[PDB]
Amino acid sequence: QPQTLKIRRPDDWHIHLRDDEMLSTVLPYTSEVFARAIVMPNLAQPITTVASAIAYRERILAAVPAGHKFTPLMTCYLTNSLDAKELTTGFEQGVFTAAKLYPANATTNSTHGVSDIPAIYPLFEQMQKIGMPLLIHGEVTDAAVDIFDREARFIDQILEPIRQKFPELKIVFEHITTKDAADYVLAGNRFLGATVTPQHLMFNRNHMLVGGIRPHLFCLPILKRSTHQQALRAAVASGSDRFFLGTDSAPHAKHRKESSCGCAGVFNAPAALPAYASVFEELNALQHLEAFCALNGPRFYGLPVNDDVVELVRTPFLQPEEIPLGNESVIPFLAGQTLNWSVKR
């Protein structure tokens, strides 16, 4: 009988569900396994009001397959013109679980993002006061800064000053990719946490570029050198409660990935939990998987831990090469590869 592992039902603290037909297609891969997910607000029209958040939440709930138990945790897209009252009442009414900071032009659907971050300090002050967490895509966008350096520059230039001025603001440093970030979070306090994706644990920039260029490994923040990958792996393997599961599943149609200018984002929802299990196994750290997947996140946000359990079984499972999307398709993470772990039905 193959090795099994019982853990509390996990949550995904960072995901893109998109909208319309894409939403219908991709959500089931998440709702099958995860009880809750932090749903990012970067649609074509960003989610900046309570009304638009309620409407999007309804569309997500309508896409949940029968027999799945799933609750989306909505987020507000911060902007330079955002009204603080909208953020405050959204949080107190339970519409917004958190607010998300995109530096302007840092990534997908970020043209309406925040251009001069210190200008919205009055929003952070209000968030600190009410206990609303701030989620951050932590990259500078200055053209003179090399893409591989943008996360590290963010830490010193933007994040540290925020933490000095608002010491009791809950901040999630989303999808960390560097030793710089890992060390900074490890040296922080209970008000600073971080999510880590499976791709930044499993791969480094050599996988994207050696022997050919692989746009399905292209995501933001970009894959870093092996040194940084190893630091992330050691961070989560340490069992520190500052790190938790956030996939940053970010699906795009195949033709938008395999083009002259490929979109950033990996569609990793289909194999997400098994992928993480494989990593924790390689790190001799399966004892810390549960905390990372199911405990650390809820404890950071101040939300309850799930009552359910899931069973991971160490039996092979082949990822499909493509996932249909109308007359187009989406290429999943680890397409055509065999994972060592499966989830028991």
Task: Report, as residue numbers or ranges, the catalytic residues.
Answer: 248
Residues in 237-256 at the binding interface with Zn ion, rule: CB under 5 A = 248
One DSSP character per residue, 162-189 reads: HHHH-TT--EEE-S--SHHHHHHHHTS-
The residue among 36 and 137 lying less far from Zn ion, judged by its C-beta, is 137
Give the binding range for a second copy (CB under 8 A) out of 33-41, 117-125, 145-153, 185-193.
145-153
Candidate list 74, 155, 232, 263; residue touching a second copy; CB under 8 A: 263
Candidate list 28, 239, 262, 298; residue touching a second copy; CB under 8 A: 262
Q: Sign of torsion, CA 102 107 108 110?
A: positive
Determine if 9 is a binding residue for a second copy (CB under 8 A). Answer: no
Candidate list 45, 259, 315, 337; residue touching a second copy; CB under 8 A: 259
Query: Phi and psi for 339 in degrees, rounded to 5?
Result: -85, 145
Candidate list 206, 287, 315, 337; residue touching a second copy; CB under 8 A: 206
The residue among 153 and 163 lying less far from a second copy, judged by its C-beta, is 153
Q: Which residue is nearest to Zn ion (CB)?
A: 137
One DSSP character per residue, 312-345 reads: EE---EEPPS-EEETTEEEPBTTTT-EES-EE--
- Identify the helix (H) or strand (E) that includes residue 205: helix 205-209
- How far the first Cα of the chain sits from its last, in Å, is 16
Residue 248 binds: one of Zn ion, a second copy, none (C-beta under 5 to 8 A by kind): Zn ion
3-class secondary-structure state, position 114 = strand
3-class secondary-structure state, position 67 = coil
Residues in 119-158 at the binding interface with Zn ion, rule: CB under 5 A = 137
State the minimum distance, in angstroms, from the CB of residue 227 to a second copy. Answer: 8
The residue among 151 and 229 lying less far from Zn ion, judged by its C-beta, is 151
- Dist. CA 257–CA 264, nearest whole Å: 8
- Dist. CA 80–CA 307, nearest whole Å: 39
Total interface residues for a second copy by CB under 8 A: 29
Strands 4-8 and 328-330, by their bridges, are unpaired
Give the binding range for a second copy (CB under 8 A) out of 36-44, 210-218, 274-282, 309-317.
210-218
The CA–CA distances, whole Å, from 24 to 40, 59, 300 equal 16, 9, 30
Determine if 1 is a binding residue for a second copy (CB under 8 A). Answer: no
> For a second copy, what does the binding mask look like between residues 90 and 109, x meaning CB under 8 A?
---------------x----
Give the binding range for a second copy (CB under 8 A) out of 38-46, 50-58, 87-95, 261-269.
261-269
List the one residue out of 200, 199, 198, 126 whose CA is nearest residue 166: 126
Is 137 among the annotated ligand-binding positions? Answer: yes
Query: Phi and psi for 255 in degrees, rounded to 5?
Result: -70, -25
- Dist. CA 70–CA 59, nearest whole Å: 13
Residue 205 binds: one of a second copy, Zn ion, none (C-beta under 5 to 8 A by kind): a second copy
Residue numbers at the binding site for Zn ion (CB under 5 A) = 137, 248
Residue numbers at the binding site for a second copy (CB under 8 A) = 105, 143-144, 146-148, 204-206, 209-216, 218, 222, 225-226, 258-264, 331
